[PDB]
Amino acid sequence: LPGGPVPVFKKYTVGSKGIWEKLRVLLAIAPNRSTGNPIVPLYRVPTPGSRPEANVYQDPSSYPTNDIAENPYWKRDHRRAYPQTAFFDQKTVTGLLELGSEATPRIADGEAGTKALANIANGGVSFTQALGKSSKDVIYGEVLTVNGLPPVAPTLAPKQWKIIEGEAAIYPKGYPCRTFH
Amino acid sequence: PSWENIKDIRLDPKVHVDEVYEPIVNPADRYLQHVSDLHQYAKYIMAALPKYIQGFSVWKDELTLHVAPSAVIPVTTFLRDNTSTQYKSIIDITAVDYPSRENRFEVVYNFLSVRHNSRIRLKTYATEVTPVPSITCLYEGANWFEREAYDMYGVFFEGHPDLRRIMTDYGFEGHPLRKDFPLTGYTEVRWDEEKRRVVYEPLELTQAFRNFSAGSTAWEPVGPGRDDRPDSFKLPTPK
Amino acid sequence: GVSQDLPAGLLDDIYMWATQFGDRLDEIEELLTDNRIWKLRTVNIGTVTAQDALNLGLSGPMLRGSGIPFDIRKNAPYDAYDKVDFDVPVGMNGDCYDRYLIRMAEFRQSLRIIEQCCNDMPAGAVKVEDFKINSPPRNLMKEDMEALIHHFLLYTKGYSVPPGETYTAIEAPKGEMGVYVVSDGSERPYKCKIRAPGFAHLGAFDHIARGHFLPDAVAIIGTMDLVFGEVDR
Amino acid sequence: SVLVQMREGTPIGLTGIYQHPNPRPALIALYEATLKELQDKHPKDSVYRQSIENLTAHRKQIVEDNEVSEVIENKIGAGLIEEVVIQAHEELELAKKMSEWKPWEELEEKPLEDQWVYFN
Amino acid sequence: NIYAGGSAAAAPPAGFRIHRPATWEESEEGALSKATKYFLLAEMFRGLYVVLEQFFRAPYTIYYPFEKGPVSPRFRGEHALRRYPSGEERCIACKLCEAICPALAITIDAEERIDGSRRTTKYDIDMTKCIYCGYCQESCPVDAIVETPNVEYATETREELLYNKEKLLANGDKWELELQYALDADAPYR
Amino acid sequence: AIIATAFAETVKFSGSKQELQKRTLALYRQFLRGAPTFADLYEVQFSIPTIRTKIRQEFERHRFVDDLSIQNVLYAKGHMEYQECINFWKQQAQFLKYFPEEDDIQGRHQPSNFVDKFLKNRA
Amino acid sequence: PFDLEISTLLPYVMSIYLVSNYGFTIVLLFLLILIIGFVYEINTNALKINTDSLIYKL
Ligand SMILES: CCCCCCCCCCCCCCCCCC(=O)OC[C@H](COP(=O)(O)OCCN)OC(=O)CCCCCCCCCCCCCCCCC
Ligand code: SF4
Ligand code: SF4
């Protein structure tokens, strides 16, 4: 089982040698536990002020961003292509109810369409009248779901939980703490 | 089999790449389908409470409902309690001082629905003399947040059982997060030897506050952006 | 991103420490997990129900102790929390002892994640590669005109944030930490409110601690894990 | 009367919520009551009523078709059956309050023109 | 299938309901063994043994001020103003350090030196406002202000903590060698 | 739950002025009654009649405020202050802020006409 | 009282041999009589210092 016990000689900690090692193994609660002291020749050596890699470091970059010949900055200028905040008041939701949408229109052409947009944008129809005139097809498709149920609060990344039991759990069976993955 | 012969990691062969490839992607693109879903959801909510919801806004993954102060109790109850919403956790409550509006403060509520893994934001407005209905009757956690909103801004919360300063000194005059309250306050304290007690005195700084905001840019920095509205939420054009 | 890239010998030293942190944890657990005095001070102290946990605004271990599996690292995968493998411990009794067990297992999960990142650290830049946001490397700043201009402006005026607002929360060690920042299009935020988990916890103190003894109040404060820089900002 | 939440007995994993003895009949009773409240005090046109009717009918069909709790909660998709009973009770109370609040009307407070202008 | 106010992710995981707690009669251990553990304090003796084992391990202490804890090139201590090898100052009064300083610690004045150079006539740091963040050092385009690895400069009155130009230059002259160590070590990473 | 504390009154904006003046007079009576408690708590040098005089001045300052909402706010703040004083939340330092007159004479020169103000650049 | 009970055994332990198997029995009876009061103390729990269901009327 990965993450299980590893012996004390694969841990970078000083420990004991000679007869004292055998004494320690005889007298230790768990013989594979390290002492906490880092190994002086190995740990934090060479010192940070004398690393050889300092004299070779170069600033890191990633293609195609570092290219000298094909990247115009405005093609990768993400700050200024930021999504606008979309504000919808009751007049706009009305307009959506009656005249349909850009994706699926329910509007006539010519002056009729523009005048319909106008008199909704003036207040000719209220939201409640909008809902009342609204047919079954439009209510079910465009307010509720196609089955007539309301939409559930959306989630960006749905998380499916699984419970780990047995040897792979953190705690054994008795403890009041379970492992969710 | 012992620590004196433990293998030196420092001399192991490290991985080496020659060129790193990171494609150029706009981070807002990942939210498109979810923005459509939030739009549909907000449409449903407005249709369900046309008496209360004055409008919504959607930005990436954050949905906001704008309501009048009288609409707060009904809308909060509907959010907390409807099966499709279930916004059981109050996250925070705050105010934002807009001195240009007739109603200065706008009160913001964030809710969290552990059932559905979804969040929502609800806004209202208030003034220095008109209060907002307290939602402590619905969410217990809102007690302290409303005491903080009052302390910082002065917004009153009608029906709050125990509304008093939570942060500022005892006997502090002024609501510090108001845009007209100066940075350094009006008073300071020191120990007074004659009186043997900490006394309050008009502010006097040894070095004056240097406001470097005078060097703000003289050129508009970002521009208009782009709209991520789904085609199912834009009014149709005739022909 | 981050201000500077890692020094040259850091991954090895982190791994060397990680080889023995497991034992360092086991020793604390030897003193604490089974001690009957510890369980006397922690079992059924500061009990909080699931529903009241949600109602009070509690998050983190204070919420996972009551049985609800909610973790922003798993729910709203931010940063590289989706590229790494780890489990989430969830209590069932919502008392000081379950929260202690939760924290003790979060130690182990953190050690696992640290090892995974030690093994999978990739190459490339550490800060976003647009010098209109983050300053350019000093070898460019001293040779290139554009880089020098951008460095000058970034450290004198600052970058301008598009107007808008956001509430962004992460799974801070103490629970859910979030910020609500209001941007007005300028270089200085219009409004910044920090949601500190300790604030909500200390708010729930009076509900949790009623009917207990004074030492139980001490233990409760301990399990809320308050810092008080968070509480008042 | 309907037993909504057991506050003692067998814990189920969530603190404060214990195993419900006879959950399915309590779900059925709550669904009947909420349907009845919608039909007697909510206008047939309102989207609130239509939505809640469809949702309650769906859940009630699922509870009546299935006898085993785990199958029911898998099909409902909203937590353990105890939590489902609490959800049904809560929806029921919300419907009774909505009767008095009357949200289907036109909105009483319009915002001023300056109310929702941000810096964009 | 189709969900109403729910979803597959909101459905309980397999096995979310916990098993019923066991009664006393369904216990594997005899009452006598449990009573042995109860009366002889088994786990308390295990704790005492773990504690006693530490008593025979190497302690962690170091003997300050004869030894010192680790220090890295990037460390941020007291401030110092650097010179060019020719001994001309490096600070050209560009005042970016003044503009970035998050604590408003830095106060600078400047004017044309008699030989025409752009130099400072007053450069103060209030070491009691500073938060030792090192922005001033990232900002300066000529590496003039730097933060030495020195932390031992505690004073007996506050007026000694208001550094003027003369003091900061003296610090630079005094610590130049160590500053060169830290620079040689970290400059590729800035 | 989180229960209110001692002498806590839920926030309620009176819809009518008269119902507000009832509460206002109750609050004034509470302050007058608490005066000796304040004198014990905060170890004040001055007398209980001086506490009561100060309270009367404080209530006097808003005697001609008309708009109801402003009166509601002033009453709420006055009650918050009363709760602050009576529960010993306040310390002596903040309490004596209310009492700037009973401190001794600050100096020889407190200017009153234009010439003395002008001499001190305060004209 | 318990202090007095404990200190009433001092004469016994200083005279155990002289009182032989007689005093032995007497001090057993004394101890058992006191043990009865100790049992009373235990069973009365003398030194020791919201679970309703939620029912809706449909
Ligand atoms: C099997 C047949 C046996 C027949 C009878 C045996 C004859 C007498 C046995 C000798 C020891 C008896 C004295 C200790 C008994 C321990 C009892 C105990 O555990 O106390 C429990 C008490 C709470 O009581 P309780 O409610 O019953 O616990 C259940 C909680 N859910 O909570 C407690 O008080 C915790 C225990 C107190 C321990 C005190 C520790 C302080 C000093 C540590 C001593 C260790 C030795 C130190 C010496 C150094 C080591 C060399
Ligand atoms: S360290 Fe920070 S606070 Fe101090 S002078 Fe530099 S920028 Fe200013
Ligand atoms: S940033 Fe550097 S060069 Fe510019 S004024 Fe400050 S110390 Fe001098």
The values of phi and psi at residue C205, to 5°, are -50, -45
> What is the Cα gyration radius of chain D?
18
What's the CA angle centered on C82, arms C76 and C88, to 5 degrees? Answer: 70
Residues 4-63 of D with CB under 8 A from G: 4-8, 29-30, 32-33
Contact A147, E2 (CB under 8 A): yes
In sign, the C-alpha dihedral spanning A20, A21, A22, A24 is positive
Contact D117, B96 (CB under 8 A): no
The values of phi and psi at residue D5, to 5°, are -130, 125
The atom of ligand 2 lying closest to the CA of E104 is: 8
Contact C129, A61 (CB under 8 A): yes
The atom of ligand 1 lying closest to the CA of E36 is: 1
Residues 40-69 of E with CB under 8 A from D: none
User: What three-state secondary structure class fits D92?
Assistant: helix
User: What three-state secondary structure class fits F64?
Assistant: coil
Q: Position B230: which residue type?
A: P
**Tokens linked to B91:** 């996250």
Determine the Cα–Cα distance for residues B123 and D32; give it in Å rounded to an integer: 35
Q: Position A116: which residue type?
A: A
User: What three-state secondary structure class fits E59?
Assistant: coil
Judge if the beta carbon of residue C36 lies within 6 A of ligand 1.
Answer: yes
Q: Could you count the other beta carbons within 10 Å of the beta carbon of residue D32?
A: 14
- Residue E187 Cα to ligand 3 midpoint, Å, equals 17
| Non-local CB neighbours of E171 within 8 Å, separated by 6+ positions | E78, E79, E80, E81, E148, E163
| Non-local CB neighbours of E51 within 8 Å, separated by 6+ positions | C31
Determine the Cα–Cα distance for residues E135 and E102; give it in Å rounded to an integer: 8
The parent domain of residue D80 ranges over: 1-120
Ranges of H-type helices in chain E? 31-40, 42-54, 96-100, 135-139, 165-186
Matching residue, tokens 């209001």? C182
Judge: D106–B51 Cβ closer than 8 Å, yes or no. Answer: yes
- Return the closest-CA partner of residue B107 out of B129, B123, B91: B123
User: What three-state secondary structure class fits F1?
Assistant: coil
The 3 state secondary structure assigned to chain C is: CCCCCCCCCHHHHHHHHHHHHHHHHHHHHHHHCCCHHHHHHHCCCCCCCHHHHHHHCCCCHHHHCCCCCCCHHHHCCCCCCCCCCCCEEEECCCCHHHHHHHHHHHHHHHHHHHHHHHHHCCCCCCCCCCCCCCCCCHHHHCCCHHHHHHHHHHHHCCCCCCCEEEEEEEEECCEEEEEEEEECCCCCCCEEEEECHHHHHHHHHHHHCCCCCHHHHHHHHHHHCCCCCCCCC
- Residue E143 Cα to ligand 3 midpoint, Å, equals 8
Neighbours of chain A (3+ CB pairs under 8 A): B, C, D, E
**Tokens linked to E123:** 């450069």
Determine the Cα–Cα distance for residues F7 and B163; give it in Å rounded to an integer: 12
State how beta strands E106-112 and E118-126 pair: antiparallel
Length of chain A: 181
Specify which residues C89 forms β-bridges with: A179
- Return the closest-CA partner of residue E187 out of E150, E148, E138, E149: E138
Matching residue, tokens 């009832």? F22
**Tokens linked to D51:** 């939505």
Specify which residues A100 forms β-bridges with: A105
Give the start-to-end residue ranges of the domains of chain F.
Answer: 1-123
Annotate D57-78 with b (16+ C-beta within 10 A) or e (fewer): ebbbebbeebeebeebbebbbb
Q: Could you count the other beta carbons within 10 Å of the beta carbon of residue E174?
A: 13
In sign, the C-alpha dihedral spanning F53, F58, F59, F64 is positive
Matching residue, tokens 């890239």? C5
Ranges of H-type helices in chain D? 23-41, 47-65, 69-76, 81-101
Q: Position C113: which residue type?
A: I
- Residue A60 Cα to ligand 3 midpoint, Å, equals 27
Contact of chains B and A by CB distance (3 or more pairs under 8 angstroms): yes
**Tokens linked to F2:** 């989180």
- Return the closest-CA partner of residue A93 out of D46, B45, B118: B45
**Tokens linked to D4:** 């909504």
Write the burial class of residue C139 (CB in 10 Å: 0-12 exposed, 13-18 middle, 19+ buried).
middle
Determine the Cα–Cα distance for residues D116 and B103; give it in Å rounded to an integer: 10
Determine the Cα–Cα distance for residues G41 and B29; give it in Å rounded to an integer: 75
The values of phi and psi at residue B187, to 5°, are -140, 155
Determine the Cα–Cα distance for residues G2 and F4; give it in Å rounded to an integer: 46
Specify which residues B158 forms β-bridges with: B133
- Return the closest-CA partner of residue A114 out of A99, A129, A101: A99
Judge if the beta carbon of residue E49 lies within 6 A of ligand 1.
Answer: no
Provide the phi-psi class of D9: left if phi over 0, else alpha when psi is between -120 and 50, else beta. left
Determine the Cα–Cα distance for residues A125 and A139; give it in Å rounded to an integer: 17
Judge: G54–D4 Cβ closer than 8 Å, yes or no. Answer: yes
In sign, the C-alpha dihedral spanning C80, C86, C89, C90 is positive
Query: What is the DSSP secondary structure assignment for residue B111, as one 8-state letter?
Result: E
On chain D, the residues whose CB falls within 8 A of the CB of C49 are 15-17
Determine the Cα–Cα distance for residues D18 and D3; give it in Å rounded to an integer: 12
Pocket probe for ligand 2: among E135, E138, E146, E147, the residue whose CB has the most ligand atoms within 8 Å is: E135
What residues does ligand 3 touch, defined as CB less than 6 Å away? Answer: E 91-97, 108, 139-140, 142, 144-145
Specify which residues E147 forms β-bridges with: E79
Annotate A113-137 with b (16+ C-beta within 10 A) or e (fewer): beebbeebeeeebbbbebbeebeee
Specify which residues A178 forms β-bridges with: C90
Greatest extent of chain C over all pairs of C-alpha atoms, in Å = 70
Query: What is the DSSP secondary structure assignment for residue B66, as one 8-state letter?
Result: E
| Non-local CB neighbours of B23 within 8 Å, separated by 6+ positions | A64
- Return the closest-CA partner of residue D118 out of B101, A81, B152, C178: B101
Specify which residues E16 forms β-bridges with: none
The atom of ligand 2 lying closest to the CA of E139 is: 7
In sign, the C-alpha dihedral spanning E65, E66, E71, E77 is positive
**Tokens linked to E151:** 């932390």
Query: What is the DSSP secondary structure assignment for residue A105, as one 8-state letter?
Result: B
Pocket probe for ligand 1: among E24, E29, E40, E41, the residue whose CB has the most ligand atoms within 8 Å is: E41
Specify which residues B133 forms β-bridges with: B158
Element (H, E) at B46: helix B32-48
**Tokens linked to C12:** 């090895």
Determine the Cα–Cα distance for residues C123 and C137; give it in Å rounded to an integer: 17
Q: Which ligand is nearest to the CA of E77?
A: 2
Kindly report whether the peptide bond that precedes residue A46 is cis, defined as omega within 30 degrees of 0. yes
- C-alpha distances (whole Å) from D4 to each of C92, D95, D97, F59 are 21, 17, 18, 53
User: What three-state secondary structure class fits B53?
Assistant: strand
Determine the Cα–Cα distance for residues B7 and F29; give it in Å rounded to an integer: 84
| Non-local CB neighbours of A77 within 8 Å, separated by 6+ positions | C130, C132
State how beta strands D2-11 and B197-202 pair: unpaired
**Tokens linked to F57:** 């001045």
Nearest CA in chain D to G50: D7
Contact B215, A86 (CB under 8 A): no
Determine the Cα–Cα distance for residues B73 and B195; give it in Å rounded to an integer: 51
Q: Could you count the other beta carbons within 10 Å of the beta carbon of residue G27?
A: 17
Angle of helix A110-122 relative to helix A90-99, nearest 10 degrees? 150
What's the CA angle centered on E7, arms E1 and E12, to 5 degrees? Answer: 105
- C-alpha distances (whole Å) from G48 to each of C41, C77, G45 are 17, 50, 6
On chain E, the residues whose CB falls within 8 A of the CB of A58 are 188
> How far, in whole angstroms, is CA A17 from its chain's centroid?
49
Write the burial class of residue F8 (CB in 10 Å: 0-12 exposed, 13-18 middle, 19+ buried).
middle
User: What three-state secondary structure class fits A59?
Assistant: coil
| Non-local CB neighbours of C24 within 8 Å, separated by 6+ positions | A36
Determine the Cα–Cα distance for residues F45 and D41; give it in Å rounded to an integer: 68
Contact C26, E54 (CB under 8 A): no
CB-based contact, F93 to chain C, within 8 Å:
no
Determine the Cα–Cα distance for residues A93 and A130; give it in Å rounded to an integer: 9
- Return the closest-CA partner of residue B157 out of B130, B188, B192, B195: B130
Specify which residues E122 forms β-bridges with: E109
Determine the Cα–Cα distance for residues E64 and E69; give it in Å rounded to an integer: 8
> How far, in whole angstroms, is CA G52 from its chain's centroid?
38
Determine the Cα–Cα distance for residues A169 and A179; give it in Å rounded to an integer: 6
**Tokens linked to D88:** 């049904």
Judge if the beta carbon of residue E168 lies within 6 A of ligand 2.
Answer: no
Binding-site residue set of E: 91, 94, 97, 101, 130, 133, 136, 140
User: What three-state secondary structure class fits D45?
Assistant: coil
Specify which residues B96 forms β-bridges with: B106
Determine the Cα–Cα distance for residues C62 and C226; give it in Å rounded to an integer: 12
Judge: B197–F96 Cβ closer than 8 Å, yes or no. Answer: yes
Q: What is the DSSP string of E77-110?
A: -SEEE-B-TTS-BS-----HHHHH-TT--EEEEE
**Tokens linked to C22:** 């497991």
**Tokens linked to B204:** 């006097």
- Return the closest-CA partner of residue F73 out of F81, B53, D88: F81
In sign, the C-alpha dihedral spanning A131, A134, A135, A140 is negative
- Residue B154 Cα to ligand 1 midpoint, Å, equals 58
Kindly report whether the peptide bond that precedes residue B176 is cis, defined as omega within 30 degrees of 0. no
Experimental technique of record: cryo-EM
Angle of helix C96-120 relative to helix C10-32, nearest 10 degrees? 160
Contact E146, E82 (CB under 8 A): yes
- C-alpha distances (whole Å) from C213 to each of A76, B80, C93, C202, C218 are 62, 34, 19, 17, 9
Determine the Cα–Cα distance for residues D77 and E129; give it in Å rounded to an integer: 57
